């Protein structure tokens, strides 16, 4: 016990002394620089700036990823006409094909519709793909598992079945047929 | 007096990143797809693709909660001015117009709430709109 | 006799070492497993950032703003309004794709 | 405290070795191009404004 | 003994002030460390692709030296975001093909980026065909608009 | 430690610039992301 304790204590004292004499001035300098920079970025205004960035950037990323049409490339923007503030009437003639069926990829494999169902503008909500199924006109939609918290309008709740309408708000995930 | 402050600041940063974990994950998922989108949209070296959508006033712009019309600057003035704070679309959480605006961003710390900034997320004072956006002036 | 002369100093040394070691022990026992888990988790990001280290400075020009590049912002954007060149495309290929 | 430090070193030593190696790999380009990092940090706030 | 007194006092003060901070920081770093470890495969490729695309996006802004060069073609716009269903979510996860990663560099051999669908509360996946705008005509006086708002174009 | 020293030195000289980035990038991000929100595109005002 005591012999090994004394010898190892002597060796570790020598090792610690060498390590300190070599590395201490730079380790202290690095710690001081880290303290200064972290204190600088954690001042009140930088604190709330970082807060608002973490709060509002994922939505910005999602929205800018939703303005990119794969078939035509680039980004899409429409020329609003402000300045009365604007015209009392508006028109949206048609929506051209932004994507194609062969191009769609899913971030998670739980979001991919099964046979007989197609994706909607709200990910995880799967319609029915038929000829008359355009514009919430085909009843019997389903929802992806783990999609709780998406409150819907009265229009799309009728087509969404009771089980899936519950799953949007309630706990259990539906069993697709 | 420097190591304890370093550890306290690191604890603050890690706490802020932990409360906003879902936000960080969403940005990390969106970034590679953003790079892929940029690669797709820059196949022509000097020109970047930017299309224009047909249709007039499909969603109208909201001037509520933004700078007044009389405060707009002439396009000739290239001079830079300090950017204003707390400007976003202040419509009363209604209509298809600006549905995904700041006022509907989820609050990470406060479950089941939507607000523009974390300062407004933490505050318990109710969110009241600056005004419905009209077509005939006085957006206030 | 010498030990009796310096008993107070020995007690002070032992108590000071104990004061240091109590806090050191609580810190090193409260962080033994979390530090190991954090290191084992960060191994992969550290390796992938080491691989991507040469391109990090070049990437920084874009990875934050993305559609904007920090280098040429002061001349393209003259304050309020972004300058842009409108090359309207009415070619049959663009009409087909649109 | 001696036991706690021995435990924290016995289990974290290979991971700290790998961490220091990876840190060297990450840091070398930053040191090589430190002027670029300083210049972009100076430049970015004006572009952001 | 004297040096032990001094070192013990100094180190004890330092550890008392900065030990709980380190412990709770290492406790709070577990979820973020796991999150960063999960999305390692999309780290090198993202940085490499942004480095490659930085000169390409800089040339657009700097080629003229006074403007930005854009190719503009008229196109149709999708239906506006509906009120309750299109509200924002922060539940995005995963990556291409179900796992984190990047697409292979987009050349002109493989031009269209595969659109990636993730939990966001909004998507443009169902725009596979030509259809009339569901709120085709709208009025901003009495809020009366023809057609039915939908999430299923 | 020495290369971390030089990196941390150039970072500490730019600590105020990091603070400026965080401050100013948090006071317009909500405003600039507003344009994207109305529909699947972004509004633009063409003065010409």
Q: How many helices (H) and strands (E) does chain F have?
A: 4, 1
Give the C-alpha separation, E88 to B105, whole Å. Answer: 6
* Three-state secondary structure call for residue A48: helix
- Are D38 and F25 within 8 A, CB to CB? no
Query: To probe the interface with A, which of E11, E82, E124 has the most A CB atoms within 10 Å?
Result: E124
Q: Which residues contact A11 (CB under 8 A, 6 or more apart)?
A: none
Nearest beta carbon to residue F39 from set B59, B75, B89? B59
Q: How was this structure determined?
A: cryo-EM
| Structural resolution in Å | 2.7
- Are A103 and E120 within 8 A, CB to CB? no
Subunits with 3+ Cβ pairs within 8 Å of F are A, B, D, E
Give the C-alpha separation, A176 to A164, whole Å. Answer: 10
F47 at B interface, C-beta within 8 A? yes
Three-state SS across B87-103?
Answer: CCCCCCCCCCCCCCCHH
- Are C66 and B34 within 8 A, CB to CB? yes
Residues from chain D contacting residue F25 (CB–CB below 8 Å): 48
Cβ within 8 Å of F, B 44-63: 53, 58-59, 61
Give the C-alpha separation, A79 to B10, whole Å. Answer: 46
Continuous segment of H or E residues that includes residue A3: helix A2-41
Report how many Cβ contacts below 8 Å link chain C to chain E.
169
Encoding tokens for residue C93?
Answer: 């290929």
DSSP E80-124: PPPTTTTS--------GGGSS--PPP--SSS-SPPPEE-SSS---
Give the C-alpha separation, B17 to E33, whole Å. Answer: 10
**Antiparallel, parallel or unpaired: β A142-143 and A125-128:** antiparallel
Give the C-alpha separation, A67 to E124, whole Å. Answer: 8
Give the C-alpha separation, E41 to A34, whole Å. Answer: 29
Question: How far away is chain A from the Cα of B126, in angstroms, using its nearest Cα?
Answer: 19
Continuous segment of H or E residues that includes residue A95: strand A94-95
- Cα-to-chain-centroid distance, residue F43: 21
DSSP chain C: -HHHHTHHHHHHHHHHHHHHHHHHHHHHHHSHHHHHHHHHHHHHHHHHHHHTSTTHHHHHHHHTTSSS-GGGHHHHB-SSSB--EEEE---HHHHHH-
Nearest beta carbon to residue A85 from set B48, B105, B134? B134
Among candidate residues A73, C49, B47, the one with its CA nearest the CA of residue E48: C49
F4 at E interface, C-beta within 8 A? no
Cβ within 8 Å of C, E 57-86: 57-58, 61-62, 64-76
Number of C-alpha atoms within 13 angstroms, CB side, residue C27?
23
- Are E152 and A134 within 8 A, CB to CB? yes
The C-alpha angle D31, D36, D42, rounded to 5 degrees, equals: 120
- Are D44 and C70 within 8 A, CB to CB? yes
DSSP E9-65: HHHHHHHHHHHHHHHHHHHHHHHHHHHHHHT-TTTHHHHHHHHHHHHHHHHHHHTTS
Phi, psi of A142 (to 5 degrees): -130, 175
Give the C-alpha separation, E43 to C58, whole Å. Answer: 15
């Amino acid at each position: 016990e005591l012999a090994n304790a004394l010898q190892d204590l002597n060796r570790v004292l020598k090792t610690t002394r060498e390590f300190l004499d070599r590395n201490g001035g730079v380790l202290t300098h690095d710690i001081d620089n880290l303290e200064q920079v972290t204190t600088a970025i954690l001042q009140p205004e930088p604190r709330d700036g970082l807060e608002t960035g973490l709060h509002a950037y994922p939505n910005l990323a999602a929205n800018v990823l939703n303005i990119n049409s794969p078939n035509q490339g680039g980004i899409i923007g429409l020329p609003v006409l402000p300045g009365f503030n604007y015209l009392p009437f508006g028109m949206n003639l048609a929506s051209t094909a932004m994507t194609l069926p062969k191009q769609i990829a899913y971030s998670e494999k739980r979001l991919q519709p099964p046979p007989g169902y197609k994706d909607t503008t709200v990910p995880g909500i799967w319609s029915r793909d038929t000829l008359f199924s355009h514009g919430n006109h085909e009843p019997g939609w389903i929802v992806a598992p783990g999609m709780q918290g998406v409150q819907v309008q009265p229009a799309t709740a009728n087509m969404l079945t009771p089980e899936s309408l519950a799953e949007l708000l309630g706990g259990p995930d539906i069993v697709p047929p | 007096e420097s190591l304890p402050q370093t550890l306290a600041n690191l604890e603050i940063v890690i706490d802020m990143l932990k409360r906003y974990n879902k936000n960080v994950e969403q940005v990390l998922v969106a970034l590679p797809q953003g790079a892929a989108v940029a690669q797709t949209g820059t196949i022509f070296a000097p020109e970047g693709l930017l299309h224009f959508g047909l249709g007039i006033n499909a969603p109208p712009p909201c001037l509520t909660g933004f700078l007044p019309a009389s405060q707009w600057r002439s396009p000739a003035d290239t001079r830079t001015e300090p950017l204003p704070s707390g400007l976003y679309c202040k419509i009363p959480k209604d209509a298809p117009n600006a549905v995904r605006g700041a006022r509907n961003y989820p609050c990470a710390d406060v479950p089941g709430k939507r607000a523009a900034t974390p300062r407004e997320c933490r505050s318990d004072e109710p969110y009241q709109p600056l005004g419905t956006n009209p077509w005939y002036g006085d957006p206030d | 006799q010498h030990f009796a002369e310096t008993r107070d100093l020995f007690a002070d040394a032992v108590t000071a070492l104990g004061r240091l070691s109590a806090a050191a022990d609580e810190t090193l026992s409260g962080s033994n497993a979390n530090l190991h888990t954090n290191l084992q988790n960060l191994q992969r990001p550290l390796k992938q950032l080491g691989r991507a280290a040469p391109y990090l400075v070049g990437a920084l020009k874009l990875i934050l703003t993305v559609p904007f590049n920090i280098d040429n912002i002061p001349k393209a954007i003259r304050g309020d309004y972004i300058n842009v060149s409108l090359k309207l495309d009415l070619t049959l290929s663009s009409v087909d794709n649109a | 405290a001696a036991g706690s430090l021995a435990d924290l070193l016995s289990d974290n030593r290979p991971l700290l070795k790998d961490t220091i190696g990876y840190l060297d790999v990450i840091q070398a380009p930053l040191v090589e191009q430190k002027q670029e990092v300083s210049d972009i940090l100076v430049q970015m706030p004006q572009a952001l404004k | 003994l004297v040096a032990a007194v001094g070192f013990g006092n100094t180190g004890g003060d330092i550890f008392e002030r900065g030990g709980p901070y380190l412990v709770r920081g290492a406790q709070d770093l577990l979820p973020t460390s796991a999150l960063l470890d999960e999305y390692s495969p999309a780290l090198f490729c993202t940085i490499r692709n942004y480095h490659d695309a930085a000169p390409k996006l800089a040339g657009a802004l700097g080629g003229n030296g006074y403007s930005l060069l854009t190719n503009s073609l008229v196109v149709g716009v999708g239906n506006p975001y509906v009120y309750p269903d299109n509200l924002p979510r922060v539940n995005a996860k995963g990556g291409p093909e179900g796992r984190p990663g990047c697409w292979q560099p987009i050349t002109r051999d493989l031009w269209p980026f595969p659109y990636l669908v993730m939990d966001t509360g909004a998507s443009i996946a169902p725009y596979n065909h030509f259809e009339l705008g569901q709120p085709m005509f709208a009025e901003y006086v009495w809020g009366r608009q023809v057609g039915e708002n939908t999430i299923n174009p | 430690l020495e290369q971390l020293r030089t990196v941390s030195d150039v970072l500490n000289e730019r600590k105020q610039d990091l603070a400026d980035i965080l401050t100013v990038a948090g006071k317009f991000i909500t405003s600039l992301a507003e344009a994207l929100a109305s529909g699947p595109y972004f509004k633009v005002m063409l003065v010409n």
